[PDB]
Amino acid sequence: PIVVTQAHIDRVGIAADLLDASPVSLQVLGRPTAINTVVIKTYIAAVMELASKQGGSLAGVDIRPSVLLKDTAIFTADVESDVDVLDTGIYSVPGLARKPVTHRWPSEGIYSGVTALMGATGSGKSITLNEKLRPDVLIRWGEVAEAYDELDTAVHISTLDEMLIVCIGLGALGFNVAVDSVRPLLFRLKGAASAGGIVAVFYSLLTDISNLFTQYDCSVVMVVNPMVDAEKIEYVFGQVMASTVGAILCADGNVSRTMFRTNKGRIFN
Amino acid sequence: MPIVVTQAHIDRVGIAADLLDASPVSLQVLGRPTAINTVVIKTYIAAVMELASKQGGSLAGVDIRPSVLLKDTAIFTDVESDVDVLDTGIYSVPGLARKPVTHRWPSEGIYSGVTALMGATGSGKSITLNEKLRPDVLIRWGEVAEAYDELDTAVHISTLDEMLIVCIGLGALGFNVAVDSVRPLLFRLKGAASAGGIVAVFYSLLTDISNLFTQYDCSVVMVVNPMVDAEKIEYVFGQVMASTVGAILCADGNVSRTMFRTNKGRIFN
Amino acid sequence: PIVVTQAHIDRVGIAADLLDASPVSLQVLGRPTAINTVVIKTYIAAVMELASKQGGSLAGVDIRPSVLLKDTAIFTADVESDVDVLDTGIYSVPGLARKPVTHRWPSEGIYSGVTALMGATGSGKSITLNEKLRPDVLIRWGEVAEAYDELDTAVHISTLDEMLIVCIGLGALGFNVAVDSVRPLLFRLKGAASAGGIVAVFYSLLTDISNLFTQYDCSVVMVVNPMVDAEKIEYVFGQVMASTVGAILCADGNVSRTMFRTNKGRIFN
Amino acid sequence: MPIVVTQAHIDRVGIAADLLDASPVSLQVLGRPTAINTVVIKTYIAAVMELASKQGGSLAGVDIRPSVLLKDTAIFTADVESDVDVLDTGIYSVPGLARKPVTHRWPSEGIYSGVTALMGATGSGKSITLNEKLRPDVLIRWGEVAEAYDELDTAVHISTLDEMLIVCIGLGALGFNVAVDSVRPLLFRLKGAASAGGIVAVFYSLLTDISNLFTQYDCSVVMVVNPMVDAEKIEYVFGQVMASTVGAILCADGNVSRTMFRTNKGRIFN
Amino acid sequence: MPIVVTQAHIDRVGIAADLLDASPVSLQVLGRPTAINTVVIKTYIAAVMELASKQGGSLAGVDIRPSVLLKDTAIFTADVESDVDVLDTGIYSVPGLARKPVTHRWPSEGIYSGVTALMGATGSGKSITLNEKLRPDVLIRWGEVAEAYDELDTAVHISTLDEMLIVCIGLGALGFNVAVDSVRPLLFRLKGAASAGGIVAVFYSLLTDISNLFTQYDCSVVMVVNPMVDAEKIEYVFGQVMASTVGAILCADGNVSRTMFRTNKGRIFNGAAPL
Amino acid sequence: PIVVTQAHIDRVGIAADLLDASPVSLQVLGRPTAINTVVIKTYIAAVMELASKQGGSLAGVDIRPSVLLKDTAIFTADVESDVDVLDTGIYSVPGLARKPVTHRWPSEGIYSGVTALMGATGSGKSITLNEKLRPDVLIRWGEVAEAYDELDTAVHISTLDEMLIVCIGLGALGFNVAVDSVRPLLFRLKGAASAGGIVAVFYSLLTDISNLFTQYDCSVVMVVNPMVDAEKIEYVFGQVMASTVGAILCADGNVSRTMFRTNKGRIFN
Ligand SMILES: Nc1ncnc2c1ncn2[C@@H]1O[C@H](COP(=O)(O)OP(=O)(O)O)[C@@H](O)[C@H]1O
Ligand SMILES: Nc1ncnc2c1ncn2[C@@H]1O[C@H](COP(=O)(O)OP(=O)(O)O)[C@@H](O)[C@H]1O
Ligand SMILES: Nc1ncnc2c1ncn2[C@@H]1O[C@H](COP(=O)(O)OP(=O)(O)O)[C@@H](O)[C@H]1O
Ligand SMILES: Nc1ncnc2c1ncn2[C@@H]1O[C@H](COP(=O)(O)OP(=O)(O)O)[C@@H](O)[C@H]1O
Ligand SMILES: Nc1ncnc2c1ncn2[C@@H]1O[C@H](COP(=O)(O)OP(=O)(O)O)[C@@H](O)[C@H]1O
Ligand SMILES: Nc1ncnc2c1ncn2[C@@H]1O[C@H](COP(=O)(O)OP(=O)(O)O)[C@@H](O)[C@H]1O
Ligand SMILES: [Ca+2]
Ligand SMILES: [Ca+2]
Ligand SMILES: [Ca+2]
Ligand SMILES: [Ca+2]
Ligand SMILES: [Ca+2]
Ligand SMILES: [Ca+2]
């Protein structure tokens, strides 16, 4: 189950302050799109109200945004991925001038941001996540029917808006949020593939997502599975390390490599 | 050869309508998410049952084609394949929080979803499907004139809308539905080819199709034959295993490899 | 000459029936487009009247659609080849529930559909077509001035609409129709080339064309010579066999390989 | 150097007008089929004959350029992209001739009417072979830098594709031996995905459509075709072009490497 | 860690305003030339000086971010595609300086005004070289993950390209040693067909246009440029970048592998000078 | 300095006759665009008027078009680079029926047109141009701050319109005009790269530019440095020789190869 502590209740006000304090946007190959902070606040309030209906114990099924919110839109005519970058402009989510809030998960003293759980298909990513990492909230997206779907920690989403709502919303409150998988986004990323058989904007998106979590004191682990050649995975993992607060590589059911940006410094394996 | 409607099928009609109304679904490829009109599937089920009532329950595949039973066969209610992912949004069909309904076909105790019948051209996919699999309903799409077209189990479709209508409609009632083949969709998949000489959205589509069947308690076998190199088929089959409930590989008229997600767990050969 | 037998006259009524009974469309990378059946019927009527005015012995020049019909259009604002597959939908011409009508040409007991006469430039396709296959009607499209143009069996077309009119129109009556060539359609196929250096929709088009002939009891031989590498022709011929009722490979002025789907079964060489 | 108008040319004027009016033609590339205004070609022929009459039959290539003789040089009669559905634009190929083509003595004996492609790498001797070995009656110069051939009285300097077809169909139908050096402005602007041989497939369709356009109007034209292709891939492309033209000439190190001509005595390879 | 405003900076304010008004500039990429609103840069300089005055000369990078000081951060003043005819859009390059450019002591001695490009593969030590060896006065942080450099009082966190140019031209003209870590948000969103070296050709034109923009406004800027390029094509890309900037530094294995600086003493390739 | 001789003053009338006599246009991948001859005439008049106010000694800074003309536009709604060639038409600047005016620069007896100074980055193109070629007017465009910018012969431009104005305007008068560089145009050439890793229209543009100078009796040297592989430069240089009146290749600070079309014939090294 997903148990709501007094620590989570005390973070509600702070979470609302963090969201209102900084206006954020996101961009991919098109034009920068603003994130409606209000929706995340509304989600937190809905989760707290339901938590109150129960004994603080929540079922992942009951906290899905499609059930709690009338509208699940976070992004507020249509632009092509091959338009002039000077007509659309360029946006990256700004960094934190202050020291980021540290966490005990996925690693000790890790800064707020995003961790990428990498590896080839069947390398043990989902296994490593649920057995070793053991998240408080397990977001399930674009993955076939598995044993992890029967878990009361599992929250089934359909859109990118829903992913960010649950990640920012619950992550800000102090929950250890995880996403399995981020394949719906990755496999629909349109554009010319750069060095490593993957679009360059993929690395920019990971940085923008990481900083979005750093700003809202979230500690999120995302399963990032790329359609990349068996030997080109090492290059891509090195490139992802420069774009995320955390990075975990899986090979043959075990953890091959690690990288974490902590209060004790950047730790490699 | 005939398609017989048992009392078991009649008793599932109400449940099928209940599953369809309970969850609103959509589908996305490289464009924008498009909603699926559930009502059309319900209307199809009612038309099949009405005809089964007039006949002895012994129905001919020719008489149950949607173009004949329905006035309009549309299930989806103009965007380029190279449009910003943030302007269209991303959609994946949500997972099942509950345990999926098990089936005896194509394998014992297999969960509801999709099975991909893979193999090179002339590897014996169509032969394995009809002789070894023995499906109740055989959907024939984008295939040249063969002996399987003269079968009373054969239902000849033209559109993707029709495929989903027969698959969800009859599959929900408990019928063992099969599609030979899904080639018109695969060969019209526009986009930049990823690792393995195939567009990445192909794997996302298989997962979205699988989850669509998992949600509506369907057990469907689709023969998937995409344009891929003779040696690159092993990589693609491994990737498809991570995107479907079932996977069957054909080589020299026989079954080379198998993967099934059952109540007894994931079984490899 | 092109001689009209009583057997052809007796098929006129059956041809109008077949054409009215099933509404057909065609799709490539755009949106599905309906085929106006009336135009084919109008063409048959104009050919029969001219055959009745002359001695039954017609000249290919006199039966060209541009001469017999006021308008040659078969297809009834503008869509790009890179448009979302979900916005246009997917269409494949439906298969035949009944047994297809057999023919003695290009092979004994062959089912109605299309035969692809394949080979590199100067492999002997056009020689094999005119000397070994001996067609009744020879449609000449996208080819330079050759000896075959002076033949009384030769009918010179300009559009794809005209090709289908003569193929379906005369083919349905029992004539052995051949197209030399289909290069104006192949070389103008816009899209990203799949495995084998050729667009995947090419194989779907051959199946759709074949089934169009299977439905209207036609036996057509099309010379198909797409821009493909000298060594990649074997792979492409292999994929084409899985997309057509007949397949003939030319090399060094002679027949290299054959495949025919007959009443006695699929025959390979 | 001069362009002389014989009685044979004068006697063909009526026949040329008949050939043009008899068959309506179009052209297509990656967009939609575009009709060719036959009237413009007839108007050009009339202007050339009138000037030939004022002179002694002896004409200067400079004086017979379409931009000088016609007020409007347009042959093709809102805007479509090269990546549009083939089914929405339709497909057009210029129809073949049911009758025997009109044979010529140039570039080869008994060669049928149509187009000949003068191929070869850059500096292989295409322009040299064209002017020294071929000896054309009319030399169309297009998209080529300043050379000795521009000072020739046979040289007619054009700017558009419309102008090329006007001079090729107009003068070729009358019986003149017309040549184009070169067709690089069309080839280098051919938009589309490059097929096998590092060149767009529609290139081969265009050569056939151009050939048949000349076959129908009994024109004997030699076009120097030099597309951007790899040094070793030229052999493959030349073989493919042979299947798309009435004539084909390959140049290598200033000399003629290979030949192909479709004649009344049959197809002749070297 | 702090950003100190000297009398030298105060004396440059007028000079900077004149430089901006004297020459009208634009920028182009694959679309239509877009004009740069000089007024916004002047307004930013005035806001920085006014705040420097309220504080004791010393300023915090957080307080000088354009989003905080200006009501609108737009520098570029309907929508054109990256694949439009070059003749329908025309071509624009920022013009060169007819006079001798203002020399600087940073990033190299006697260097001309313009842009310096700090190259290297990922984890080659670009950010380390920038902060330890180069020591910039103002550190612009853009599209980079949470690092130790973000806690620095020299760090100014931006989000747009408009903001980058405002801080670079605005503070750089006054005499500050401005650095950008990273320029990746721009590089990773460069739409177009990749040329030789697995990178769009307009990338090199943009570096030259950015360099000349700084040469005209007497700025000395160091931009860290991380290219999505294969391990073996980095040498080719660097050679090409050297021909497009006033300064270029290559990083490899935590150290400086190669340098190029256009100084008053001439073009110096791989000099004996610690940064 | 830039000195105006009596020879230049005597050419003013002839330059107007040349510009008025032939209407010209330019095309790239879009539609043909007319060149407004009047603007070039206006520029010549402004240069001569200023040369008069001076002692015949002009500063390159004072003769820049942005300073002398109110509007710098030469080309007189918006078309895509991937539009049908038949809808835009094709334009090449026409050749000269007469013998071209000869020059003593960059080579003895060279015909009027364009010379391409080629070579890898840092091969010594700019060095060869200013030390060995010694041009009368050095147009500086899209190049970084160098010693050549402080030269009184240097004229700094921003647009392609400005380049052609100075090249045609001053070149027609007899000045030895050079451009360092033509990179702003070359690095913004949109389209599919042909053989040699460069767009085919690049070679057509060089010929069109060369013929534009041949028609207006100009002798211009352009630094052409396109993004091409280290080994592919030899192929491209050979192709450029077939597209220009002059061609110079640079390697390791020295001149590797030369080609000039003179009154004494085509001279190779
Ligand atoms: N093709 C295969 N054959 C055998 N076992 C496999 C195969 N693919 C995966 N496995 C098993 O599944 C485990 C990985 O499961 P999982 O965590 O779901 O992988 P991932 O999330 O990376 O796709 C492996 O350690 C192995 O035991
Ligand atoms: N090229 C070939 N040569 C010989 N036999 C072939 C060939 N291609 C297919 N076959 C025969 O057809 C069988 C496969 O039929 P089928 O099930 O229709 O294949 P698929 O559906 O995979 O295309 C093979 O087992 C073999 O007996
Ligand atoms: N490159 C060539 N060299 C020599 N003869 C050739 C060549 N190409 C074709 N031929 C001749 O033409 C014949 C093939 O003719 P044809 O059927 O028209 O070819 P295609 O396969 O292109 O339709 C060959 O048998 C040979 O006699
Ligand atoms: N790179 C070169 N080196 C030496 N001579 C050359 C070179 N390129 C061309 N030539 C000379 O020019 C002749 C070819 O001239 P030309 O007919 O104009 O060629 P093309 O029209 O095929 O481009 C060759 O036979 C040779 O004498
Ligand atoms: N894969 C790695 N394994 C070990 N150390 C690494 C790795 N990647 C980077 N480092 C360390 O980080 C340093 C580079 O840090 P940084 O300046 O942030 O690089 P950059 O800015 O070029 O991405 C290296 O000198 C090395 O000590
Ligand atoms: N990577 C380098 N290493 C050393 N010297 C170099 C390098 N690149 C250029 N140079 C020097 O600069 C000279 C070339 O200068 P320049 O004319 O500006 O070249 P270009 O115009 O072709 O880019 C060379 O002759 C050499 O002395
Ligand atoms: Ca998994
Ligand atoms: Ca099959
Ligand atoms: Ca042939
Ligand atoms: Ca030539
Ligand atoms: Ca860094
Ligand atoms: Ca230079």
User: E109 — phi, psi (to 5°)?
Assistant: -65, 125
Distance (Å, whole) CA C135 – CA C67: 22
- The structure tokens listed for C83 are 């448009």
In DSSP terms, A248 is beta-bridged to A117, A258
Helices (DSSP H) in chain E: which residue ranges? 7-22, 38-54, 66-69, 86-89, 126-128, 161-173, 184-187, 202-216, 234-242
The residues, ordered by sequence, that sit 6+ positions from B161 with a Cβ below 8 Å of its Cβ are: B40, B66, B73, B74, B75, B76, C89
* Residue F153: exposure state from Cβ atoms within 10 A (0-12, 13-18, ≥19): buried
Q: Say yes or no: D49 contacts chain C, CB-CB below 8 A.
A: no
Residue type, C69: L
Nearest 5 degrees, angle CA C183-CA C189-CA C190?
150
Q: Say yes or no: C186 contacts chain D, CB-CB below 8 A.
A: yes
Residues on chain A touching B204 (C-beta within 8 angstroms) = 142, 183-184, 187-188
Instruction: Tell me which residue in B89, B96, B99 faces A160 most closely, judged by beta carbons.
Output: B89
Determine the residue of chain A that is closest to B27 in CA distance. Answer: A158
Chains touching F (at least 3 CB pairs under 8 A) are D, E
State the distance from the centre of ligand 6 to the C-alpha of A15, rounded, in angstroms: 57
The residues, ordered by sequence, that sit 6+ positions from D205 with a Cβ below 8 Å of its Cβ are: C142, C183, C184, C187, C188, D93, D244
- The structure tokens listed for C70 are 């006021």
Q: How far is CA B168 from CA B41, B102, B113, in A?
A: 7, 16, 10
Side-chain half-sphere of F83: how many Cα atoms within 13 Å?
20
Please check whether residue C114 is in contact with residue C120, taking contact to mean a CB–CB distance below 8 angstroms.
no
Ligand 4: residues with CB < 6 A are: D 120, 122-128, 251, 254; F 238, 242, 268
- The structure tokens listed for B196 are 């393995």
The residues, ordered by sequence, that sit 6+ positions from E19 with a Cβ below 8 Å of its Cβ are: E173, E216, E217, E218
Question: Residue written as tokens 């990203």?
Answer: C192
The residues, ordered by sequence, that sit 6+ positions from A86 with a Cβ below 8 Å of its Cβ are: E27, E28, E29, E31, E34, E76
Q: How far is CA E135 from CA E57, E127, E167, E222, E274, in A?
A: 20, 11, 17, 11, 12
For chain B, the structural domain boundaries read: 23-269
Please check whether residue F105 is in contact with residue F231, taking contact to mean a CB–CB distance below 8 angstroms.
no
Distance (Å, whole) CA A130 – CA A146: 12
Distance (Å, whole) CA A166 – CA D172: 75
- The CATH class of B23-269 is alpha beta
CA E188 and chain centroid, separation? 16
By alpha-carbon position, which residue is closest to atom 11 of ligand 1? A122
Which H helix or E strand runs over F159?
Answer: none
Distance (Å, whole) CA C100 – CA B145: 8
State the structure-solving technique. cryo-EM
- The structure tokens listed for B135 are 């499906």
Cβ of B242 less than 6 Å from ligand 1? yes
D23-270: CATH architecture:
3-Layer(aba) Sandwich (3.40)
> Measured between alpha carbons, how far apart are the two ends of chain A, in Å?
32
Nearest residue to C222 via CA among C157, C167, C143, C152:
C167
Distance (Å, whole) CA A253 – CA E82: 44
Let me know if domain E23-275 sits in CATH 3.40.50.300: yes
Please check whether residue F206 is in contact with residue F214, taking contact to mean a CB–CB distance below 8 angstroms.
no
> Measured between alpha carbons, how far apart are the two ends of chain B, in Å?
29
Please check whether residue F61 is in contact with residue F2, taking contact to mean a CB–CB distance below 8 angstroms.
no
DSSP letter for each residue of chain C? -EE--HHHHHHHHHHHHHHHHS--EE-SSS--EEB-HHHHHHHHHHHHHHHHHTTSEE-TTTT-HHHH-S----B----BSSB-HHHH--B-PPPPSSPPPEESSSSTTEESEEEEEE-STTSSHHHIIIIII--SEEEE-S--S-GGGGSTTEEE--BHHHHHHHHHHHHHTT--EEEE--HHHHTT--S--BTTTB-THHHHHHHHHHHHHHHTT-EEEEE---S--TTTHHHHHHHHHTT-SEEEEEETTEEEEEEEEETTEEEE-
Side-chain half-sphere of E243: how many Cα atoms within 13 Å?
25
Please check whether residue A189 is in contact with residue A227, taking contact to mean a CB–CB distance below 8 angstroms.
no
State the distance from the centre of ligand 12 to the C-alpha of D237, rounded, in angstroms: 38
* Residue B209: exposure state from Cβ atoms within 10 A (0-12, 13-18, ≥19): buried
Instruction: Tell me which residue in B89, B92, B207 faces A161 most closely, judged by beta carbons.
Output: B89
Question: Residue written as tokens 């063909």?
Answer: D12
Which H helix or E strand runs over F145?
Answer: none
Q: Say yes or no: A245 contacts chain E, CB-CB below 8 A.
A: yes
Please check whether residue D27 is in contact with residue D92, taking contact to mean a CB–CB distance below 8 angstroms.
yes
Distance (Å, whole) CA E119 – CA A118: 27
In DSSP terms, F179 is beta-bridged to F139, F222
Which H helix or E strand runs over D221?
Answer: strand D220-224
Distance (Å, whole) CA D204 – CA D182: 17
The residues, ordered by sequence, that sit 6+ positions from D152 with a Cβ below 8 Å of its Cβ are: D1, D61, D131, D139
State the distance from the centre of ligand 5 to the C-alpha of E124, rounded, in angstroms: 6
**What is the radius of gyration, based on Cα positions, of chain C?**
18
Please check whether residue A201 is in contact with residue E188, taking contact to mean a CB–CB distance below 8 angstroms.
yes
Query: What number of other Cβ atoms are within 10 A of residue E116's Cβ?
Result: 28
Please check whether residue B3 is in contact with residue B60, taking contact to mean a CB–CB distance below 8 angstroms.
yes
DSSP letter for each residue of D110-162? TEESEEEEEEESTTSSHHHIIIIII--SEEEE-S--S-GGGGSTTEEE--BHH
Ligand 5 pocket test target in E119, E122, E127, E132 with most atoms within 8 Å of CB: E127
SS (H, E, C) chain B: CCEECCHHHHHHHHHHHHHHHHCCCEECCCCCCEEECHHHHHHHHHHHHHHHHHCCCEECCCCCCHHHHCCCCCCECCCECCECHHHHCCECCCCCCCCCCEECCCCCCEECEEEEEEECCCCCHHHHHHHHHCCCEEEECCCCCCHHHHCCCEEECCEHHHHHHHHHHHHHCCCCEEEECCHHHHCCCCCCCECCCECCHHHHHHHHHHHHHHHCCCEEEEECCCCCCCCCHHHHHHHHHCCCCEEEEEECCEEEEEEEEECCEEEEC
In DSSP terms, B257 is beta-bridged to B249
Question: Residue written as tokens 């017979």?
Answer: D64
The residues, ordered by sequence, that sit 6+ positions from E233 with a Cβ below 8 Å of its Cβ are: E197, E198
Q: Say yes or no: C162 contacts chain D, CB-CB below 8 A.
A: no
Determine the residue of chain B that is closest to A153 in CA distance. Answer: B97
In DSSP terms, F118 is beta-bridged to F249
Ligand 2: residues with CB < 6 A are: B 119, 121-127, 250, 253; C 242, 268
Distance (Å, whole) CA B158 – CA C212: 12
Residues on chain C touching D211 (C-beta within 8 angstroms) = 144-145
Let me know if domain A22-269 sits in CATH 3.40.50.300: yes
Which H helix or E strand runs over E191?
Answer: none
| Phi-psi map region of F232: left, alpha, beta (phi>0 left; psi -120 to 50 alpha) | alpha
